[PDB]
C-alpha cells in the first residue's frame, strides 16, 4: 500500500509509473530513498534538497517531498482515506487489549519483524508515537534485530532443527485418514 501511495505522490511530482513493470521500480525507489520524519509538519515547511534517484534506463528523477510523506501513511492511514488504526496504534491496542499485569512486560519487550520496519527512522518515530499513547513513566524497549527482513525464516530454521518439531508436523498418511481438520487442529 505504501508502494501504491508513493506512485500517486510521484504522479503529483510529475513522474508516471502506469505499467506493472514500472510499479516494481517504485518499490525500488521506496526501498532506496524514503525516511520517516520525527515531526512531519516541520519537514513539509522546510525546503527539500530534492535527492536525485537513477532509474534502470539511466534517467534521473528528483523525488523531493514525496520521499518522506509516502511512508507516513503507515502511521496515519486516514490522510489518503483508508479506515485503519495505524502501525503505532495496533502495537499499543494489542498491549492494552491484553491483561493489566502483562502490559508493563509487553511494553518492555517489543520486537520489530518484516521488511516494512527497515524505513530510515522507523524505530525513532514509533518510540515517540507509542510513548504519547502508552501510560506515563513506563519503560518502552523496541528491540529490532539486524536481520529484520530474514527474522521470520531464521525462527522457522531453529524451530525445524528441534526434535519437538518431529511431533508437531502432520504426516501424509495422517492427512488421508484423519481428514481436513488434521492441518488446523495441529497448527497450535
Amino acid at each position: 500500500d505504501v508502494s501504491r501511495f508513493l506512485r500517486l505522490y510521484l504522479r503529483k511530482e510529475g513522474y508516471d509509473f502506469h505499467s506493472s513493470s514500472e510499479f516494481e521500480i517504485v518499490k525500488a525507489i521506496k526501498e532506496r530513498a524514503c525516511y520517516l520524519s520525527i515531526n512531519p509538519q516541520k519537514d513539509e515547511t522546510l525546503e527539500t534538497e530534492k535527492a536525485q534517484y537513477y532509474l534502470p534506463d539511466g534517467s534521473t528523477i528528483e523525488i523531493g517531498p514525496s520521499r518522506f510523506r509516502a511512508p507516513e501513511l503507515l502511521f496515519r492511514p486516514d490522510l489518503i482515506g483508508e479506515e485503519s488504526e495505524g502501525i503505532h496504534e495496533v502495537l499499543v491496542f494489542a498491549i492494552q487489549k491484553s491483561d493489566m499485569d502483562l502490559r508493563r512486560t509487553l511494553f518492555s519487550n517489543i520486537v520489530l519483524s518484516g521488511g516494512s520496519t527497515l524505513f530510515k527512522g522507523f524505530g525513532d518515530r514509533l518510540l515517540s508515537e507509542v510513548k504519547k499513547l502508552a501510560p506515563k513513566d513506563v519503560k518502552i524497549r523496541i528491540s529490532a534485530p539486524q536481520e529484520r527482513l530474514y527474522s521470520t525464516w531464521i525462527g522457522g530454521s531453529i524451530l525445524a532443527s528441534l526434535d519437538t518439531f518431529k511431533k508437531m508436523w502432520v504426516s501424509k498418511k495422517e492427512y488421508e485418514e484423519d481428514g481436513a481438520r488434521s492441518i488446523h487442529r495441529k497448527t497450535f
Partner: protein, 379 residues
C-alpha cells in the same frame, strides 16, 4: 460582485469564459507563437524549470484575459479547473502567476471530476476523464472524492496520435504531384501533430465490440488465415496543398483499438472503471455503478460511449470481476454540455455561487502573507 472567470488549462485545449453561462466563450489550442520559433511552444509542460514555465503561462493568461475574454484581471475572481494529481510545481506556478503578475482577487483550485458531477445534479457518481495525456478515473461519493480508489492509464489523445503516426508510416501512400501518382512511402520523416489530430477527428471512428474483437485477433494473426472484417473505403487527405495522402480503411478502425486492447496486463480504458469500482467501499458499489460520467474530448470520438459500455459488460463476465461486479447495472449519464466542455460547465455553475466561492477560494492577502497554496498533500 462581478461574474467570476473560469479557466481550465489542458495539454491539447484550454476552456475559457464567465460563470453562469450555458458553455465556454472561447476554446483554443494551449500554445503561444513566440518570435523565432516556427512551431508554437506548448504552454503547459510538466518537469521543466519554473522561470521558463512562468514566462509561458504569463504569455498565455495575457492572451486569454484580453484577446479571447475582454475584462480586467484585478477586478473579478478566478475559478481554475485542474485535474486531481496535477504536478505540484505547475499548480504552484499557475497560482503564483495569477497572484503576483495579474494580481487577481482569489483563485479556487477545483478538481475537474467533482465539477463534472455538479453539471448533472446527482450528488454521487463515477467519473472517467479520457484527456490528451492520461485517461484518469476518480469515484466521487456525495461530494467527497475517494483518492484511495484512483486509476490512470496513458490511453488518451497523445497515445492515440502517436499510434496513428506509426500506422500511417507503415502503409504510407501519398500523391506528392511530381510523378507520385504511384504509391510513395515516407516522403516526410515525421507528420505534424496538427494534421494527425485533424485525420483522427474526421477519418477515424470507434468500431463495435463484435467487429473490434475480430480486428484485435486479425492483426495478431493467431494461427488463422485472413480472419478480419471488411474495412471502410480509403479516404484521401490533403497534406500541405499538393501532397494527397491516401488513408487505408484498416488504419481508421485499428488506431482506436490500442485504447480497448487488453495487452495481457488487462489494462484498457474499459477495465479502469471496473478496476477502480472493485477497490471502492462495499456500500458505495451499487450507487457508483448506476451513475457513470464520461467527460474528456477523447470520448467525443464517434461510437466511443457504446463500445465502452459494451466492453464494460463483457469484462464484467470475465472471471476476475465476475464475483464482485457480477450482477451490477451500469448506466451512463448524458451531461447537458458536450463531453469536452463538462469540466468547464461545473466551474461556471460553482462560479455563479458568489457566497460559497469567496469563502472556499484562497484570497491574494492570504497568499502574500503565507506563500502556501492548500493541496491534498500534507500541510
Amino acid at each position: 460582485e462581478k461574474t467570476a472567470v473560469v479557466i481550465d488549462l489542458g495539454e491539447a485545449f484550454t476552456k475559457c469564459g464567465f460563470a453562469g453561462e450555458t458553455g465556454p466563450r472561447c476554446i483554443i489550442p494551449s500554445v503561444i507563437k513566440k518570435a523565432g520559433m516556427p512551431k508554437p511552444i506548448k504552454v503547459v509542460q510538466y518537469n521543466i524549470n519554473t522561470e521558463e514555465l512562468y514566462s509561458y503561462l504569463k504569455e498565455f493568461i495575457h492572451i486569454l484575459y484580453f484577446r479571447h475574454l475582454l475584462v480586467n484581471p484585478r477586478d473579478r475572481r478566478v475559478v481554475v479547473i485542474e485535474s486531481v494529481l496535477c504536478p505540484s510545481h505547475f499548480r504552484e506556478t499557475l497560482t503564483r502567476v495569477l497572484f503576483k503578475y495579474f494580481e487577481v482577487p482569489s483563485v479556487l483550485l477545483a478538481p475537474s471530476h467533482l465539477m463534472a458531477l455538479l453539471t448533472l445534479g446527482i450528488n454521487s457518481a463515477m467519473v472517467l476523464d479520457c484527456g490528451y495525456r492520461e485517461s484518469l478515473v476518480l469515484p466521487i461519493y456525495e461530494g467527497i472524492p475517494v483518492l484511495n480508489c484512483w486509476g490512470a492509464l496513458p490511453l488518451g489523445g497523445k497515445a492515440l496520435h502517436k499510434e496513428l503516426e506509426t500506422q500511417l508510416l507503415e502503409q504510407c501512400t501519398v500523391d506528392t504531384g511530381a510523378a507520385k501518382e504511384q504509391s510513395l512511402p515516407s516522403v516526410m520523416g515525421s507528420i505534424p501533430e496538427g494534421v494527425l489530430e485533424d485525420i483522427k477527428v474526421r477519418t477515424c471512428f470507434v468500431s463495435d465490440l463484435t467487429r473490434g474483437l475480430k480486428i484485435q485477433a486479425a492483426k495478431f494473426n493467431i494461427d488463422g488465415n485472413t480472419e478480419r472484417p471488411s474495412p471502410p473505403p480509403n479516404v484521401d487527405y490533403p497534406l500541405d496543398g499538393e501532397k494527397i495522402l491516401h488513408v487505408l480503411g484498416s488504419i481508421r478502425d485499428s488506431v482506436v483499438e490500442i485504447l480497448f486492447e487488453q495487452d495481457n496486463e488487462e489494462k484498457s480504458v474499459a477495465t479502469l472503471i471496473l478496476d477502480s469500482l472493485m477497490q471502492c467501499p462495499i456500500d458505495t458499489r451499487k450507487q457508483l455503478a448506476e451513475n457513470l460520467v464520461i467527460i474528456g474530448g477523447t470520448s467525443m470520438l464517434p461510437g466511443f460511449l457504446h463500445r465502452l459500455l459494451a466492453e464494460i459488460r463483457y469484462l464484467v463476465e470475465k472471471p476476475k470481476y465476475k464475483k464482485t461486479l457480477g450482477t451490477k447495472t451500469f448506466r451512463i449519464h448524458t451531461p447537458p454540455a458536450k463531453a469536452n466542455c463538462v469540466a468547464w460547465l461545473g466551474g461556471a455553475i460553482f462560479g455563479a455561487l458568489q457566497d460559497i466561492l469567496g469563502s472556499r477560494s484562497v484570497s491574494k492577502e492570504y497568499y502574500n502573507q503565507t506563500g502556501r497554496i492548500p493541496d491534498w498533500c500534507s500541510l
